[PDB]
Amino acid sequence: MNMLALTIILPLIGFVLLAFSRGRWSENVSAIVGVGSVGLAALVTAFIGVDFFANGEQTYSQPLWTWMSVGDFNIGFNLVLDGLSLTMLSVVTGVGFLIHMYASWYMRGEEGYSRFFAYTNLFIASMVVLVLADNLLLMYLGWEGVGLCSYLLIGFYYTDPKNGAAAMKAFVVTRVGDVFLAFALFILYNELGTLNFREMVELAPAHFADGNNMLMWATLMLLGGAVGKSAQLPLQTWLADAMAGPTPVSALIHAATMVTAGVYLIARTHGLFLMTPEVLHLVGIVGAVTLLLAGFAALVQTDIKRVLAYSTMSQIGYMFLALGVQAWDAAIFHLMTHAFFKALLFLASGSVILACHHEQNIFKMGGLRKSIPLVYLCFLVGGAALSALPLVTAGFFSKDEILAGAMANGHINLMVAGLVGAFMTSLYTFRMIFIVFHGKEQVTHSLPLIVLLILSTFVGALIVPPLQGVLPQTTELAHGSMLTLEITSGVVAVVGILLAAWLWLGKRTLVTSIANSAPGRLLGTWWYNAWGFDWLYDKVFVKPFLGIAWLLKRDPLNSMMNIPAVLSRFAGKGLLLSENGYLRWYVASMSIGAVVVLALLMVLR
């Protein structure tokens, strides 16, 4: 278990080597370095899990050095490992290893190969730092590393200014959420005097026995940081534009690293959120609203990648609902299963966009099952797991546990919202699948596809998270009650896919009747632009920022301090009018001064 720091050291070494290589190395050597770094991280993680289960699942701590030490401010470089940290360490390492294999096949002949692999290695290292951190400041270091690597990888094609604008907007939105996280850090250190999570859980109910407003503020700011990183309300707008990057970048962001950081922050500080029930209720409400809005947005999207983005938004909203109903185990189970099938869907979409020309609309594509059937069945199982198809997909069991935890704690409305979201999820997923793959035609990568094919089924559901002794157990349900909820969820999913097949498989006449209707056009244009959130954030934040910058670009304070210079020049030019060179005026001025001096002497005598 002593090799816990190797999971950070090896991706850091790979990133440094591939950054200082500067593309001088061959493609095979760069691929070997990057994929081998992430694979050695995965192997060290596997050995760590073996040794973790061999010792009876005990929480381990590995300190390296003390980061900062000023008075009571003591922050250290201590890694921690419990069941949750091991769970998403395994998720991040394995999914990143598969994505790195797929990207090593995918980016052959691309400019920036070593730079891409260095950035992804730094992404992996930052997320391992995030999930292994014992305190909030080291987790903040991993948090900002995740944000910076996402910004660098989204705008990987730096020649296109749209990619750069998308990366800049994603970095700004994540940094606003990161500022909210720092607000939580400042409040927690000011109240408790420590930043270690276990020490907060120990010393919080004693300190907050009388007043709980500051703990409420800290948990609210933690929720703000979580919705900033996990793309929820009100900081969700960055993902659809962040889609503009490469495909394995999207797979790493939506499956392994970026969107799971908020869920990690909610689940790791579960004690502090348990001390603030209203904030946890707000987490559940935010998750429900985000999943509903994401489904309604993805129903009308005209691209595969945007549909997958809003599907990621909806499933992160599902996880936030699970956290809000105190179903933590269901949230982490859905975390790993959604990582598997969303990685599969994104890699399959990248294969599709490689096989079918350049980027195109979904209505351009049709009947693609015959030409590319392997990635068609990859899309089929990934959409079945996304839509929670019963008895064959791990997503069904994950959403089943989420909804069982939702209704087991009295959250009826959140369960209803989750069922409606599952219905809409099946609707948009099979709408995209039937539009793209049905109609009329117009070894490096096969192994990760095979692994994500297997893990998207119930084989992924066979993996039980080792979360006993870390997160509290969800309250159990009556067997008939969860049987009824299971059959209701299966009925909802099956009627969703049946409605999608009735609407989009054949000649879309009922679909084009709704779409070409004026209220249908209005609702489609509303949902297609992310419910006008980007428009509002441009008109409320971006536009006055640009206006203030344009107003201030002449430096008004510099002119306000240049006022006495122009006053001095004007006064000097005015005083130079007395020196006209006339002797009679000089004698007159001498007499004038004589009268002035004399009169001043007598009035002040």
Binding site: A19, R22, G145, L148, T159, A182, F545, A549, L552, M561
Partner: protein, 504 residues
């Protein structure tokens, strides 16, 4: 004992590099490099022999080294030098920045390089003397003496593409600002000395004797106002800030002048050393105005840096924002915020030094500085865009670099003191990320917007790459292991904080 040599070795080296020009025109750069190496080695030996990690706070005065020699005994004026943790850290930073400034002017083989290097040596010696003098008249003397070579360097060796008259205007605005503010400082020094003389009856100009002075409220407020006006011009603090982009834009193209005396934060050292201990009640009353001026400086510098089409003016406004952060930290009264201010000072010096050297190299490569005439420089340059990305990431407060560490202890201490200033400054950090990304995407990303950026450019030499990688390594080490720097400056910061809070 070593402190007089720490001051006059730059002066003697400047004299020798002026006088050695007849032996060859490539000689004075070697003399300047050797002299700055000796100064930095003396500072490092003082760091080793000081034992600063094991030094505890014992109260002002507490100097790990001292020196005294009478200079004008009529007024009780002596050349009085002293070193402790914070002063030695700033002297080491000055030596390192002077070494980088000498190495950054290696390729200038012009016919009057001896005067250039003598002026550089005199600037660095004046900065060291400012960091070392605990006699108020000597401190003011160094404070104004380090600016005449700056004026002559800007006005004569400045931006050769620009006309001379613009350089004259910029250098004259800089010198007028600094000298008028320092004249207000000298008036404050004289009035404090006369208050001491009326109270006790002995002529003195020593900071140790001027600490324990009996005085009323309102005169102390005016005296602190004079000191703060001088430091706020030098810091800079808005609206006394336009000399910084005016001097940076018309600086010599190597960027060594920015490293020599501009990027070394003598004003924050003066605020910590002289403004707070001599006038604690006035500083406590001025703390809301100081924090709000820092907030306005952060956001004004952010909005100016985003609006700038020029790289040097952009980095100048980044400096304005970061010293707004430091000014916020200085008046809180928290030891954590003070240590964060010291870390932010050192890390900002390193990061802005890297940014200025990279901008100078970029201007040497492309012969223009407007950002609308470049773009997509990642594909046309070998090392410069990657290091520029690292330094811009450093300036926005990214962990793994000391800027994040410094301003985060600043915000931690500030939130322990005042929450609203902290939250508004943290949105200022959002603005800082905004302007850093704006500079990166205007300069090195996108398509080429002119003809010079559409062709390949020559790469860096071993010297430039060595200096930039040294700055990168130092910034990464400061970001990940800042503990020796905190332990060096812990005693003096504790003395200043205890004096500030034990009298209010």
């Amino acid at each position: 004992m070593l402190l007089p040599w720490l001051i006059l070795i730059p002066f003697i080296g400047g004299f020798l590099c002026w006088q050695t020009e007849r032996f060859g025109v490539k000689v004075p750069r070697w003399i300047a490099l050797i002299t700055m190496g000796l100064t930095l080695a003396l500072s490092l030996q003082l760091w080793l022999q000081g034992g600063y990690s094991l030094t505890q706070s014992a109260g002002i005065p507490q100097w790990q080294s001292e020196f005294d020699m009478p200079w004008i005994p009529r007024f009780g004026i002596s050349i009085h030098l002293a070193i402790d943790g914070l002063s030695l850290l700033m002297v080491v930073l000055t030596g390192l920045l002077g070494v980088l400034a000498v190495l950054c002017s290696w390729k200038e083989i012009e016919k009057y390089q001896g005067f250039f290097h003598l002026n550089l040596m005199w600037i660095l010696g004046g900065v060291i003397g400012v960091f070392l003098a605990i006699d108020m008249f000597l401190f003011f003397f160094f404070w104004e003496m380090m600016l005449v070579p700056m004026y002559f360097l800007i006005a004569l060796w400045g931006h050769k593409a620009s006309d001379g008259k613009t350089r004259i205007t910029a250098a004259t605005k800089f010198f007028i600002y600094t000298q008028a503010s320092g004249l207000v400082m000298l008036i404050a020094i004289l009035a404090l000395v006369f208050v001491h003389y009326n109270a006790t009856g002995v002529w003195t100009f020593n900071y140790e004797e001027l600490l324990n002075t009996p005085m009323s409220s309102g005169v102390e407020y005016l005296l602190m106002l004079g000191f703060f006006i001088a430091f706020a011009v030098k810091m800079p603090v808005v609206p006394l800030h336009g000399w910084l982009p005016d001097a940076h834009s018309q600086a010599p193209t190597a960027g060594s002048v920015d490293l020599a005396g501009i990027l070394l934060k003598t004003a924050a050292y003066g605020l910590l050393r002289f403004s707070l201990p001599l006038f604690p009640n006035a500083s406590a009353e001025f703390a809301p105005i100081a924090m709000w001026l820092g907030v306005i400086g952060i956001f004004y510098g952010a909005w100016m840096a985003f609006a700038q089409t020029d790289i040097k003016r952009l980095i100048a406004y980044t400096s304005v924002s970061h010293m707004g952060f430091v000014l916020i930290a200085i008046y809180t009264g928290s030891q954590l915020a003070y240590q964060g201010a010291v870390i932010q000072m050192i890390a900002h010096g390193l990061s802005a030094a890297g940014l200025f050297i990279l901008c100078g190299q970029l201007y040497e490569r492309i012969h223009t500085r407007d950002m609308r005439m470049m773009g997509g420089l990642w594909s046309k340059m070998k090392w410069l865009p990657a290091l520029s990305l690292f330094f811009a990431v450093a300036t926005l407060g990214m962990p793994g670099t000391g800027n994040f560490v410094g301003e985060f202890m600043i915000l931690f201490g500030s939130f322990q003191v005042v929450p609203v200033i902290t939250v508004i400054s943290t949105f200022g950090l959002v603005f800082a990320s905004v302007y850093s990304l704006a500079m990166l995407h205007r300069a090195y990303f996108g398509k080429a917007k002119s003809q010079i950026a559409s062709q390949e450019l020559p790469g860096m030499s071993l010297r430039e790459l060595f200096m930039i990688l040294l700055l990168v390594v130092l910034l990464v080490l400061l970001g990940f292991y800042p503990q020796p720097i905190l332990d060096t400056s812990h005693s003096a910061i504790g003395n200043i904080q205890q004096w500030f809070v034990n009298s209010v």
